[PDB]
Amino acid sequence: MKFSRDVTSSRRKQRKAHFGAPSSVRRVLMSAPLSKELREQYKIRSLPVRRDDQITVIRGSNKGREGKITSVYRKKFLLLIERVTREKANGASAPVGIDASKVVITKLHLDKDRKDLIVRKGGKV
Amino acid sequence: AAARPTVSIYNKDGSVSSETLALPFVFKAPIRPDLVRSVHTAVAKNKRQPY
Amino acid sequence: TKTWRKWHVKVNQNEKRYAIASAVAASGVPSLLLARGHRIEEIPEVPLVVDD
Amino acid sequence: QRSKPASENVYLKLLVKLYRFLARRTDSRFNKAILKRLFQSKTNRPPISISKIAALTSRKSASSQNKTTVVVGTVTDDERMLTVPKLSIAALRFTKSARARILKAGGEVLTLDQLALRAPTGSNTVLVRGKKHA
Amino acid sequence: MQQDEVIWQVVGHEFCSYRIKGEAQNFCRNEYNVTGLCNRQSCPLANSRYATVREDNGKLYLYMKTIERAHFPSKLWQRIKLSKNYAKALEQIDQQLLYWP
Amino acid sequence: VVFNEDTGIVKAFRNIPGVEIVNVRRLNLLQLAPGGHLGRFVIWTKSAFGLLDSVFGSTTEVAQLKKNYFLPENIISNADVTRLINSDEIQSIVKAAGPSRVKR
Amino acid sequence: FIKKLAANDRKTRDKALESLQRFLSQKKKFERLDFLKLWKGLFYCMWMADKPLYQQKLSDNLAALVPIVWIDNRILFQSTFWETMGREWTGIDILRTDKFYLLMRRFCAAAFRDIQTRSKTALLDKVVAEYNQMWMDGPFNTENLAFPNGILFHLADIWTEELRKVYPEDVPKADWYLPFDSTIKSSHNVVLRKTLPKRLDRVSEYT
Amino acid sequence: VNIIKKRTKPFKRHQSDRFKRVGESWRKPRGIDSCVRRRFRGTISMPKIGYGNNKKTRYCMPNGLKAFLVRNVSDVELLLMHNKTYAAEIAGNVSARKRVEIVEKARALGVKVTNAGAKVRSQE
Amino acid sequence: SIFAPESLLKKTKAQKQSREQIVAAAAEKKSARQKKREL
RNA sequence: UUGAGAAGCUCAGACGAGUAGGCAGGCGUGGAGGUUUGUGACGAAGCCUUGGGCGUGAGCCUGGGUCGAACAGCCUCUAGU
RNA sequence: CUGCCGAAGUUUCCGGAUAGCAGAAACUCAGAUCAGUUUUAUGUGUAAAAUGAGAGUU
RNA sequence: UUUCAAUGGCCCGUCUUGAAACACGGACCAAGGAGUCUAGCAUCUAUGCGAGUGUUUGGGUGAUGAAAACCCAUCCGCGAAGGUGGGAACGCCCUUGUGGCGUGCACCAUCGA
């Protein structure tokens, strides 16, 4: 149960926060789990999604099929996965979107900032 | 009013203990479903907000 | 609708203590516990007392 | 007309349940009278003071013997009189001041259920009432 | 603490969680009802001494409770097993429910 | 769960769905008679149970903690009527019994 | 002693009884108050006796508690029981009144048995009068109205019935029926006076 | 004691046929000069306590059983001892999954189910 | 085993006495019925 | 003989217009604490339908067709009913 | 929505206070009083038999 | 259910009028839509206490919504300032029943104060 008066428990106010959030607040709302062996390697539970991160879809019609994240579409909370597409009328590919909390991160894109983030949360490489 | 003088205390492990407590005098007081209703009826309107 | 409606209701204290002494008394009768929906068909004893 | 109390004291619906059986299964008018007065409103059941009861049993020739005074209603005390006499009383309710005063010096207080198991027919009982005018 | 009269005056009339308000009659969801209706003779909670027959995996058992075990919910319902032979089943009930109403 | 001292009981049981913990000295009717209905399942503790003789009192003595408060005194002593009626002291004096249902 | 008698499990209530075996055989005078406190414990020992076969074996165990008490305070032990059953008789409830009827039936029979035993030592008229004095200041006292009649009707009903069992061969002349003849005479409960002979089974063939 | 009714046709509201804003639910006509309220000839009837049916037959289906609404499979079990007078009506929102559990249980119990063939389909 | 609850022995005695009284009075009332019919 | 929801069951007789008005018991809507260890993507609510029932009646339960995410029976509380 | 009771519709003084009708309660009585009643008889009224109903109060 | 056959039945609400006559209001359907909220007074009933009574101005307190609950100090308000007979109920009887002898509630008559 919430006890702080700094937090709120309002469907109206919490949804206002969710869809009124800007990108620098949406980058934490779009997080992803880590693979079990990788989760314990860095001793961290979940990390925010990122372009060029190798992931496997776990839920939906595209369950199981892996790939990377071509680009993270923050304004609608979606992940664009290469080769996970859809045949439009005109034969082109309109790539379907997957939410960040369904996929699982298998291979991270090791940036200098990501490494600091790992060791910041009591982790290690 | 005669009823059940002693109650038995249960340890953490679940086994009864040899110690006992006399049933408190409150546990024989009148049981009044109407009086509890018309008091809960009132006392429950005391954390209300005005609209 | 007016905010000065009667929201809070007065009960004498000796009415409140009676309703609560009665409320405590009826928590020692197992029948009034089952009949309220409590799943205490395997409770070792009522009133149920543990140690400190 | 009156054949169900307006009350919701659950224990008064058990007292009536005892005196509905007694009234219809005995030939005494004490029971038929007691049952009627268990139906009366709170206004119609006046408090009857201890001193008024003390005067009634010890009235004129006295000779109280060990008769039991019975009243449907409360029996409030009277601090204006010091020495309470020995009394056996049955009533719906007492006041903690009165019930102590009867108990401390003399006999005992009873509820209508303890009178019934002793005098189901109203055997040697004085049935009093408080002043109605108020 | 254990009165069939006050317990009934609550459950019977104020609120009992097992009663189903029918159109003509009230039914009791309590598992230990020998009749299945909400009555005064039938209700398992008011009656301090009670006996019911209910099956448990293809075998009919006779469940019985007493006033002197009414305060311990775990050990409240003594149970015996009724034999397949119907005639012997009825002799079992009488020799166990004897001097009961 | 009715306790007497806070040392970790309130933060133990609280997350358990439904289990409410309230002190002995501030028992609340919305927690002993929820919905207006009597008979909430209470799990006392030994220190709390022993204080019950002092928070409520008796019909003769008075609660040490609630000033000048005596428990209510009832309309009757033996609340079981079927014992009052079906006793010898009454059934020995009632007149004869008619049929429960009179034939037409 | 007292607390364990009214325990919530029989395996500990039972063990209190044979621990009471030595206690009631003590060779010293016991005040009435100690017996009243004891008898509450024993009254609640019988209160929760569940099984009908068991609750009629315990009555025989409790009736057998009479002759083992010292001869001096045996009357006091009997007297307190009749007092400690008169005051709590209203508390009992229909399903629990079938065992105190028998329990009172057992004890009222144990009173006669003690007379038969004491008749061998002292004069029959002396001990019977002393027991008769026990009924005068106890259940059959006209001064206190606190005593229920349900016990008094019961005692009359089973008075002579257990007199024959105690004396199979014959009963000698004695004031066996004096307590009733001293109640239907001057008792102020007119209903008890009126309906006592109609339930008694008094015979004057030997008295 | 057979299931006999003092009237079949329902009581319609007066002038409820003419209008559509006027509902067919029976409403007592309180019109001061209302001749139909005044019980003239050629008018309609009006509900009276004289139209009540036999108290040993009220709530009884034409086959003699009184409908009893069972929500889940627990409810169908308590009709064990009234199967000769009550019929297990299955609630309208009970899914086809539990609907079979209710009908198979009730068939062995001996009780009669009124809507036992709804949303389901047999297969041999 | 189980000597019957004596609260029932009280009832048996009362009902037997009531049975005896109504049975005894039946002979006289029936006997008076014929004479009443003859009259 | 089981017929103690004693607020129950049972028996007997007479009676039945109705405005103003007086009294009583109920039906229904939104929400509230308790409850049904309630119902629901194997289809909630709603909607239509010469499907079947229940009640003197207010009203209710159900079948079929649409429908697609919630809802209800019971005891009380409450009102923009 | 159903069930029960259900007038007055106007005297009388004077916009009213009364009354009356209807209720609602509390009382005391059926071994007591009554009646849009009828007789008997004394002088149409009055007083005292039948026919019925329990009647009277606040 | 539609339809037919035989018998029937002057448009509803308001207002008017004994009654109608009327004069009004009504094209149809959906939704919205009118004794409510509050302070004062009196009555009836229910509950708690009862020569008392009323925690909620406020203070104490409340770790799990803490605007709830629970507890009480100093005031304060509102109260408080004999005989006679008829009688409810009961006992004693005793020719029982009938009644008498009594004890006599609430209250009413009476004398009273």
- Which residue ranges make up each domain of chain D? 1-134
Q: Is G47 on the interface with B (CB under 8 A)?
A: yes
The DSSP letter of residue H60 is B
CA-CA-CA-CA torsion sign (C43, C44, C49, C50)? negative
d(CA D88, CA D106): 8
What is the SS3 assignment for D14-70? HHHHHHHHHHHHCCCHHHHHHHHHCCCCCCCCCCCCHHHHHHHHCCCCCCCCCCEEE
- For chain B, the C-alpha Rg in angstroms (whole number) is 19
Task: Choose from E94, E96, E99 for mutation: most chain I CBs within 10 A.
Answer: E99
Q: How is residue B33 written in tokens?
A: 């479903």
Pairing of strands D125-127, D108-110: unpaired
Q: How is residue E93 written in tokens?
A: 């009930």
Query: Rounded to whole angstroms, what are the CA distances from D48 to D56, D96, D123, D128?
Result: 11, 15, 21, 8
Query: Rounded to whole angstroms, what are the CA distances from E22 to E19, G172, H93?
Result: 9, 69, 19
Q: How is residue C48 written in tokens?
A: 């149920």
Distance of CA B33 to the CA centre of its chain: 14
Q: How is residue A15 written in tokens?
A: 């949804």
Torsions phi, psi for E60 (to 5 deg): -80, 125
Q: For chain B, what's the residue count?
A: 51
The DSSP letter of residue H50 is G
Token match 């309230």: residue? F22
Provide the positions of strand L that have an atom within 7 A of a protein CB: 8-10, 12-16, 19-20, 28-30, 37-39, 44-56, 61-73, 83, 88-92, 103-107
Q: How is residue D77 written in tokens?
A: 């005390």
Q: How is residue G131 written in tokens?
A: 């027991």
d(CA B14, CA B12): 5
d(CA H61, CA H3): 7
* Owning domain of residue A21: 1-125
d(CA F37, CA G76): 49
State the DSSP H helix or E strand holding residue I38, giving kind and residue range, or none if neither.
Answer: helix I6-38
Q: Cα distance from I21 to chain F (closest Cα, Å)?
A: 11
Alpha carbon distance, N-terminus to C-terminus of chain B: 49
Q: Which of E52, E86, E47 is nearest to E70 (CA)?
A: E47
What is the SS3 assignment for chain C? CCCCCCCCCCCCHHHHHHHHHHHHHCCCCHHHHHCCCCCCCCCCCCCEEECC
Domain ranges in chain E are 4-101
d(CA G30, CA G74): 10
* CA atoms within a 13 Å half-sphere pointing along the CA-CB vector of C37: 7
Torsions phi, psi for D33 (to 5 deg): -75, -40
- Provide the β-strand partners of residue A84: none
Q: Is B2 on the interface with E (CB under 8 A)?
A: no
Please give the method by which this entry was determined. cryo-EM
Instruction: Specify the 3-state DSSP secondary structure of G162.
Output: helix
Q: Is D62 left (phi over 0), alpha (psi -120 to 50) or beta?
A: left
Contacts by D19-23 with C-beta closer than 8 Å and gap 24+? D19/D112, D19/D116, D21/F85, D22/D116, D22/D120, D22/F85, D22/F90, D22/F94
Distance of CA G119 to the CA centre of its chain: 19
The structural domain count of chain A equals: 1
Query: Listing from the earlier edge strand, what are the strands of the sheet with B16-22?
Result: B16-22, B6-10, C48-50, F43-45, F2-3, F22-23
Read off the amino acid at residue D9.
N
Q: How is residue D59 written in tokens?
A: 């009235």
Q: Do B27 and C49 touch (CB under 8 A)?
A: no
Q: How is residue B25 written in tokens?
A: 């005098």
The spacing between the Cα labelled CA in H101 and the C1' in J66, in angstroms, equals 27
- Residues with Cβ within 8 Å of residue D56, at least 6 apart in sequence: D69, D126, D128
Q: How is residue H47 written in tokens?
A: 């509900």
Torsions phi, psi for E28 (to 5 deg): -110, 125
Tell me which chain G residues have a C-beta less than 8 angstroms from the C-beta of E67.
93, 95-96
d(CA E45, CA E33): 9
Instruction: Specify the 3-state DSSP secondary structure of H79.
Output: helix
Q: In this structure, are residues C31 and E9 in contact, taking their beta carbons and an 8 Å threshold?
A: no
- Residues with Cβ within 8 Å of residue D15, at least 6 apart in sequence: D38, D92, D112, D113, F75, F76
Q: How is residue H115 written in tokens?
A: 């809507």
- Residues with Cβ within 8 Å of residue G80, at least 6 apart in sequence: G32, G35, G36, G38, G39
Q: Which of A111, A20, A109, A38 is nearest to A71 (CA)?
A: A109
Q: How is residue C11 written in tokens?
A: 């009960």
d(CA E29, CA F98): 36
d(CA D78, CA G168): 61
Instruction: Specify the 3-state DSSP secondary structure of G149.
Output: helix
d(CA F67, CA F61): 11
Q: If 0-12 CB within 10 Å is exposed, 13-18 middle and 19+ buried, where does residue E3 land?
A: buried
Torsions phi, psi for F85 (to 5 deg): -75, -55
Other Cβ atoms closer than 10 A to G38: 21
d(CA F1, CA C27): 12
**From E2, which residue of chain F is nearest by alpha-carbon distance?**
F80
Q: Which of G90, G93, F78, C21 is nearest to B32 (CA)?
A: C21
Q: In this structure, are residues B43 and F29 in contact, taking their beta carbons and an 8 Å threshold?
A: yes
Query: Rounded to whole angstroms, what are the CA distances from B44 to B31, F31, H115?
Result: 20, 11, 43
- For residue B50, give the nucleotide whose C1' atom is nearest its CA: L67
Pairing of strands C48-50, B6-10: parallel
Q: How is residue D76 written in tokens?
A: 């409030």
Q: Is I4 on the interface with G (CB under 8 A)?
A: no
Q: In this structure, are residues G53 and I1 in contact, taking their beta carbons and an 8 Å threshold?
A: yes
d(CA A56, CA A107): 10
Q: Is A91 left (phi over 0), alpha (psi -120 to 50) or beta?
A: left
Q: In this structure, are residues B33 and E14 in contact, taking their beta carbons and an 8 Å threshold?
A: yes
Q: In this structure, are residues G183 and G140 in contact, taking their beta carbons and an 8 Å threshold?
A: yes
CA-CA-CA-CA torsion sign (C27, C32, C38, C43)? positive
By Cβ distance, the residue of F36, F50, F72 closest to B41 is: F36
Q: Which fold has domain E4-101?
A: Enolase-like; domain 1 (3.30.390)
What is the SS3 assignment for A10-27? CHHHHHHHHHCCCHHHHH
State the DSSP H helix or E strand holding residue A46, giving kind and residue range, or none if neither.
Answer: strand A46-48
Read off the amino acid at residue G146.
A
Residue C37 CB in 7 A reach of strand J = yes
State the DSSP H helix or E strand holding residue G109, giving kind and residue range, or none if neither.
Answer: helix G97-121
State the DSSP H helix or E strand holding residue G55, giving kind and residue range, or none if neither.
Answer: helix G52-63
d(CA E16, CA F35): 12
* B neighbour chains, 3+ CB pairs within 8 Å: C, D, E, F, G
Q: How is residue H32 written in tokens?
A: 């001061």
- Provide the β-strand partners of residue H69: H89
d(CA H80, CA H108): 10
3-state helix, strand, coil in chain D (%, to 5): 35, 15, 50
Buried b (16+ CB within 10 A) or exposed e, E58-68: eeebbbbbbbb
Q: Which of I4, F86, I18 is nearest to G198 (CA)?
A: I18
Other Cβ atoms closer than 10 A to A8: 13
Packing angle, helices I6-38 and G97-121, rounded to 10: 100
Q: Which of E35, E34, B40, E17 is nearest to C32 (CA)?
A: E17
Distance of CA H16 to the CA centre of its chain: 23
**DSSP string for I6-36:** HHHHHHHHHHHHHHHHHHHHHHHHHHHHHHH
Contact: chain H with chain D (3+ CB pairs below 8 Å): no
